[PDB]
Structures are given as C-alpha cells and as structure tokens.
Design a protein around this ligand. Structure first.
Ligand SMILES: CCCCCCCCOCCOCCOCCOCCO
Ligand SMILES: CCCCCCCCOCCOCCOCCOCCO
Ligand SMILES: CCCCCCCCOCCOCCOCCOCCO
Ligand SMILES: CCCCCCCCOCCOCCOCCOCCO
Ligand SMILES: O=C(O)c1csc(-c2ccccc2O)n1
Ligand SMILES: O=C(O)c1csc(-c2ccccc2O)n1
Ligand SMILES: [Fe+3]
Ligand SMILES: [K+]
Ligand SMILES: [K+]
Ligand SMILES: [K+]
Ligand SMILES: [K+]
Ligand SMILES: [K+]
Ligand SMILES: [K+]
Length: 674
C-alpha cells in the first residue's frame, strides 16, 4: 500500500546525529527534502552521546531555534521557538497531543525528538496550551529484530546515581511482535545548593508488524520529586535594571520547597491497509498527571539584589484523553498524483487545580535562602475539586499534489477546529466561564526540486490559541476573548551535498495579542510580528567529524500595542540573535575515542514591553567525550558530558521574569550491551 509508509521511521542522516525526515502531523513522515517546512529530528544516538535526560537538555544544546525558560532546577521547562513561547504540555507524541509528562518530557525512552518550526494548526490541530512557535514531536523506541540487553550506570554532580535498562525483544513468527522496555532510576543531590531529585521512569514500546496491519501501544510511567525548587525571578513595578546573575549554584527561592510530579500514559495506535490506495488509521490514548508542590517565585525589590519570595501551594489532578482516526489514499488525475489525508481528532481533559498564595519572605539573589516558615496550606488537603474541562476536536482534509515526477509538490489542506472549555471556581465550585468556538484554518505549500539535491519551498500555515479571559480588574473582567489566529509565511531552500546539508529559511509570523487599554477594556487588538532568517548546516562534512551549526536572526516586533512606550519595540524574552555550533570528532589517533564540544549563544533580550530592562547576551560551552571498548567480547562505552564547562552564570529573559542558568554540570556514564 502506498500509504503504508506514513509511520515508517526515517533513516538516520550522515553522521547519525540527526534523521533524514520527520513528522508533518496528519501527513505522516516526510523526508527533509520533501518537506516545505523547517524540520530537524535528533536521534537516540545524540541523546545517549550527550547524556541528555529531558527535551530541554537536548534542544538547547543543539538547536539554534530553541531556547529554554525554566531549566532543570525548576519544576517546568518551556521553550521559545521563532520568537513565541511553546509549552512543554504542547510536546507531541507521534503527532498526538496530551500524552507526555505535563511539565518536563524525559527522553531516555525516545528514538527521536523532532522539531517542526513555526505554527502547524492545519497539520496537527490546536495544541492544548495554544502554542504556535513550533511543534516538538517525540518518537518512542521500538524493538529491533536483533535482541538488545543494554544496561548503563551514571553519576551526575553532585551525587545523582542512575541506572538505565534498555531491553528489546521480538517474538512470534517473522518477529511480528516487538517489546522494548526502558527503566530508569536516578536519585541524589543535584548541582544546585540544597537540592535533591528522585526520578523513576518506566516505558514499554509494543508493536505488531503484519501484512496489511500495523499496531503499537506505548505505556509510560514517570515521577519527578524535587527537594528544592528553583523558580522564576520576577520584575517589580520599580525595577530599574536587571542585577547581575548570581552564582548558578546559589538557590535564592524557597528553601523547603518541594515538587512531586507524576505522569503516566498509554496510547494505542493502528493502521490497516484497506487497499493498495487506501489505509485506515486510528489512535486512542490517555494520560494521568498528578501535581503537588510548595514553592515560591522570587520578586525583585529595589535594585541591589534584594528579593521577596511569594509562596504558594499548588495541587493538580489532570486526566486527558486524546484520539485520532482517519484515512490516507492516493489517485491520479492525468499528470497529477494526489496523496490525500482525511483526519479527525479529539482531546478531552478534566483538570482539578487548586492553589493558595500565602507568605512573602525577604531574601537576596546572592544568598542561598535559609530555612523559612511554611504557611499552613491544609485547606487544600483532600480531594482536588474539578476546576476545568477542555474539549478540542477537529476534522481535516489535506491533499499533496505531485507533478512532473515529484519535482513539483503542492500541498493544500483545511481543518475545522472546535474549541471548548469550562471553568469552575476552586472554592465555590461556581461555573465561571464556558468558552465554545469553531474556526477554519488552512495551509498551502509548494516545493520544487530544480536539482535532485536542492529543494526550494514556500508555505502558508496558521497557529491557533484559545482567547484569554479578561483579568478580574478590567471592565469586561472574566470575559474570555475569541481565539487568536497566528499566520505564517515561509520560504526556504535546502541543499543536500550528500554527507552534509545546508538550509536557509525566511519566515514571518503574525499573531494577535491581548492587553488592557485606557478604557480598562481587555481586547485582542495587539499584534506581534516576528520576521526571521534561519541558517543551518549539519552532517559529517569530513570523515569522523560531525557538525551541527546554525544561527537565527529575528525581528520580534510589538507592531501594535495600546501604548507609545512599547509601540514597535521588541517582544520581551526574544533575543534578536541566537546560534549553536556542535562538533563531534572521532579522533584518528585513539581507537574508539570521540571528543565533543558545543557552543551555545543567545543575544541580549528584554523583559519588559518598553525595553527599558535589557538582559545581557550569554554563551555556554559544553565538552564531551565517549570511549568505546570491549570487555569479554561485549561492547562498552564510557561517557563524560560537561555542560556549561566555563561555569557562566546568566539570565534567560522571558516576558516579565528571568530564569537563572544551571551551573557547570558533569555527568559520567558506563553502558554495556549483553
Ligand atoms: O515567556 C517567554 C517569552 O516568549 C515569547 C512568548 O510568546 C508569546 C506567544 O506565545 C503564545 C503561543 O506561542
Ligand atoms: C567516564 C568514565 C565512566 C565511569 C562513570 C560510571 C559512573 C557510575 O557509577 C555510579 C553508580 O550508579
Ligand atoms: C507484544 C506487543 C504487541 C503490540 C500490539 C499492541 C496493540 C495495541 O493496540 C490496540 C489498539 O490499536 C488500535 C488503535 O485504536
Ligand atoms: C472525504 C473526501 C476526501 C477525498 C480526498 C480527495 C482529494 C482531495 O479532495 C479534493 C477536494 O475535496
Ligand atoms: O498563580 C500562579 O501560578 C502565578 C501567578 S503569577 C505567576 C508567575 C508569574 C511570573 C512568572 C512565573 C509565575 O509563576 N504564577
Ligand atoms: O504557570 C505558572 O504560573 C506556574 C507554573 S508552576 C507555578 C508555581 C509553582 C509553585 C509555586 C508558585 C507558582 O507560581 N506557577
Ligand atoms: Fe505561577
Ligand atoms: K533537564
Ligand atoms: K519529568
Ligand atoms: K498545534
Ligand atoms: K546512563
Ligand atoms: K531556572
Ligand atoms: K547553564
């Protein structure tokens, strides 16, 4: 069947650090040179080589277009992509939303971590968090035919001890069935003052390989428990400048904070080839997410480095269902080949989320905080009441027209997207809001291959975000606005020299934003207009020398505000320049030895809409090494990764707050295949 390849895992590219292709949502997997989008897919090889544990670890080290807000000391990572914030809750799982750990995705069970840059509502529907900067997609591990019995042990500053089992088996006639299990247990003191972390994780990738039938089921369990929670530093009404970043080992937030975050999910997927030119597919999954924390956000007071920590307890019970069904077919109209996809999806979520802010405790950026009182938060004990219900569902039809022996490709699609949410007050249980909307959202793209190894492309595509509720201060307080429609135009070029590829892209993304005006009326009358250029090179351009290099330049314009002080200024939290350079070098002179280095750069950015508060540019250097050897006939690999090797301390800017950098962090690991 022609559509039977939609879920086929893309081959690794030269060097094995990235893959040749990635998911285009409802369209399934596309080769990089057939994709009229900027897509990058990082491999398990890279994940294991750099000892990346989370999406954030991997993406900020390697990708010129992804920067992380929060960080591994915090309970939550978020990602900025093409000048827009992308929630970790909007990370996709084989294209499906709502099924991965809500605050921080671990990737030690991942075969691929893909980045599709820019919005993609036509391809995937709306994301639960409304993100539009890009879609990160995780592809889970599957069992290969040759059995895998892999064990590794690892140490990470200051005392985190870990073990990782990666076991794969196939069985049944013709290895029709596969089982891949990943188990991680990592526990101990982190690199940050007075912080410890416990991390159990279990995953099973199950699949069935049949003549006209393909099935899979993914089960995931994970918990992250932190003693000590790093949190944002907020700007105050009279902040005049951003103080110099403290030592990243210092922890200036709530000393006796804690996080207990548990997620588990199951997702079953299938395809069935009804004919040579018709394939049915369906997915159904669910996720439970349990959230418990007491922590404090730091607020600048004065400008000498004093802070006040604002304490809170938060509790969450989130229950998500996420499903898709559809058909993929193909036919011809003369010289046109049609490859069409009809897809429908549905996400349904029930959330209980209670919180109480109590306590304001003085501190200082440059002092690890002392033990301070924890307020009585017992009124949140017991059952967590329902506070929100979300229902997203859509139907999409897309057609890829192939002309002139597939050297010209035109893709058209439209999706009808339904959005519905209901909110209930955490104390009274009163129904505070019921938002219900539908929107149509289209795409158009064209790709031309003048050379076999040169692809030129353009796309138009939209992003969708649920409208915001007006703050309980404005004239229309509580009213939640119409959905925000972001719009992207992109053009680019991709050139595949065989062992390495160079890409270029120019994009614009326009998105409405909401502010309270002079009439204290909350309206969606603002607009952000991000215009950017992206360049990258990746591959193995010399034998035994792999290179991933990229840079981006963006003008992130607040091109419509209700304010002259901010009109035309830069969106906060969006550096105009970012670049990454990674080199991995198989030394010709030591057998089995590989040396890695990375340089991450982020230019100056602002925290405020008026741009009166700039944060400096920053640089991070990583050093790595891998040593492959044999003992008793079995392969072993010893690894070392030194993140932030120079021990630089820096702020990452966001809109209204800053996240402190993670300190210099060595991890060491030994892996054996039995
Ligand atoms: O805080 C991080 C700042 O990054 C820019 C925020 O992007 C605003 C729009 O995001 C909505 C969906 O991407
Ligand atoms: C880089 C050399 C490999 C040695 C690192 C192994 C650390 C495992 O010991 C921790 C036990 O858990
Ligand atoms: C021994 C591993 C066998 C893996 C097959 C698991 C099949 C689970 O999928 C069932 C539902 O799939 C249809 C989607 O709805
Ligand atoms: C539900 C019908 C989907 C069949 C796809 C046919 C090719 C695309 O449709 C063209 C316009 O409709
Ligand atoms: O209710 C909350 O969780 C809440 C209110 S402001 C806030 C906040 C504001 C800036 C940065 C991080 C934050 O967590 N958080
Ligand atoms: O989105 C947010 O505002 C958010 C996410 S965790 C969080 C938080 C967690 C512990 C204490 C205070 C907080 O504000 N806040
Ligand atoms: Fe918060
Ligand atoms: K991390
Ligand atoms: K996690
Ligand atoms: K999306
Ligand atoms: K390991
Ligand atoms: K942080
Ligand atoms: K760092």
């Amino acid at each position: 069947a022609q559509a039977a390849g939609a879920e086929t895992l893309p081959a690794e590219y030269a060097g094995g650090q990235v893959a040749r292709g990635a998911r285009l949502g409802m369209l399934g997997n596309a080769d990089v040179m057939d994709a009229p989008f900027s897509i990058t897919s990082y491999t398990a090889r890279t994940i294991e080589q750099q000892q990346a544990r989370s999406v954030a670890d991997l993406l900020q080290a390697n990708d010129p277009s992804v920067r992380v807000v929060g960080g591994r000391g915090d309970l939550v990572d978020s990602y900025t992509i093409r000048g827009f914030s992308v929630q970790n809750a909007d990370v996709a799982f084989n294209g499906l939303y709502g099924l991965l750990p809500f605050w921080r995705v671990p990737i030690e069970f991942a075969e691929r971590v893909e980045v599709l840059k820019g919005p993609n509502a036509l391809l995937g529907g709306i994301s639960p968090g409304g993100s539009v900067g890009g879609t990160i997609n995780l592809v889970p591990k599957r069992a290969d035919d040759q059995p895998l019995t892999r064990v590794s042990v690892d140490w990470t500053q200051r005392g985190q001890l870990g073990t990782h089992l990666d076991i794969g088996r196939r069985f049944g006639e013709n290895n029709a069935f596969g089982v891949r299990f990943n188990g991680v247990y990592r526990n101990g003191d982190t690199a940050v003052d007075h912080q410890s972390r416990e991390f159990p994780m279990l995953s099973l990738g199950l699949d069935f390989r049949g003549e006209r039938l393909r099935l899979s089921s993914d089960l995931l369990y994970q918990k992250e428990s932190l003693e000590g929670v790093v949190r944002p530093l907020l700007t105050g009404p009279g902040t005049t400048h951003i103080p110099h970043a403290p030592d990243s080992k210092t922890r200036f937030g709530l000393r006796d904070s804690y996080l207990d975050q548990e997620d588990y999910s199951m997702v079953n997927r299938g395809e069935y080839d009804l004919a040579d030119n018709l394939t049915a597919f369906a997915s159904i999954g669910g996720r439970q997410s349990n959230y418990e924390t007491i922590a404090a956000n730091s607020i600048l007071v004065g400008n000498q480095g004093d802070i006040v920590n604002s304490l809170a307890r938060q509790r969450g019970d989130r229950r998500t269902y996420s499903a898709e069904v559809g058909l993929r077919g193909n036919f011809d109209t003369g010289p046109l080949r049609h490859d069409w996809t009809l897809s429908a999806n549905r996400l349904h979520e029930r959330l209980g989320m209670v919180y109480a802010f109590t306590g304001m405790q003085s501190g200082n950026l440059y002092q690890t905080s002392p033990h301070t009182p924890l307020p009585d938060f017992s009124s949140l004990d017991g059952s967590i009441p329902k506070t929100n219900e979300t229902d997203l569902g859509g139907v999409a039809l897309a057609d890829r027209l192939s002309f002139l022996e597939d050297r010209v490709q035109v893709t058209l699609g439209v999706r009808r997207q339904q959005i519905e949410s209901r909110n209930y007050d955490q104390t009274s249980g009163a129904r505070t809001s019921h938002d219900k909307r539908h929107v149509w959202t289209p795409m158009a793209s064209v790709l031309v291959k003048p050379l076999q190894d040169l692809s030129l492309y353009a796309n138009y595509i939209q992003g969708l975000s649920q409208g915001e509720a007006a703050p309980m201060t404005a004239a229309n307080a509580g009213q939640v606005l119409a959905p925000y429609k972001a719009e992207q135009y992109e053009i680019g070029a991709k050139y595949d020299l065989g062992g390495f590829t160079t890409t270029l892209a120019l994009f614009e993304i326009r998105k409405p934003n909401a502010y309270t005006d002079a009439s204290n009326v909350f309206r969606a009358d603002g607009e952000q207009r991000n215009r950017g250029v992206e360049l990258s090179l990746y591959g193995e351009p010399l034998d035994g020398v792999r290179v991933m290099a990229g840079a981006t330049y963006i003008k992130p314009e607040q091109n419509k505000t209700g304010d002259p002080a901010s009109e035309g200024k830069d969106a906060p939290g969006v550096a105009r320049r970012q670049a990454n350079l990674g080199v991995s070098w198989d030394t010709p002179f030591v057998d089995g030895l590989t040396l890695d280095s990375r340089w991450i750069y982020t230019g100056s950015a602002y925290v405020d809409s008026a741009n009166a508060l700039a944060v400096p540019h920053w640089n991070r250097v990583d050093l790595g090494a891998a040593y492959a050897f044999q003992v008793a006939g079995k392969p072993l690999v010893a690894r070392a990764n030194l993140e932030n090797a120079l021990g630089k301390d820096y702020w990452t800017a966001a809109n209204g707050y800053l996240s402190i950098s993670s300190p210099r962090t060595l991890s060491l690991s030994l892996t054996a295949d039995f």
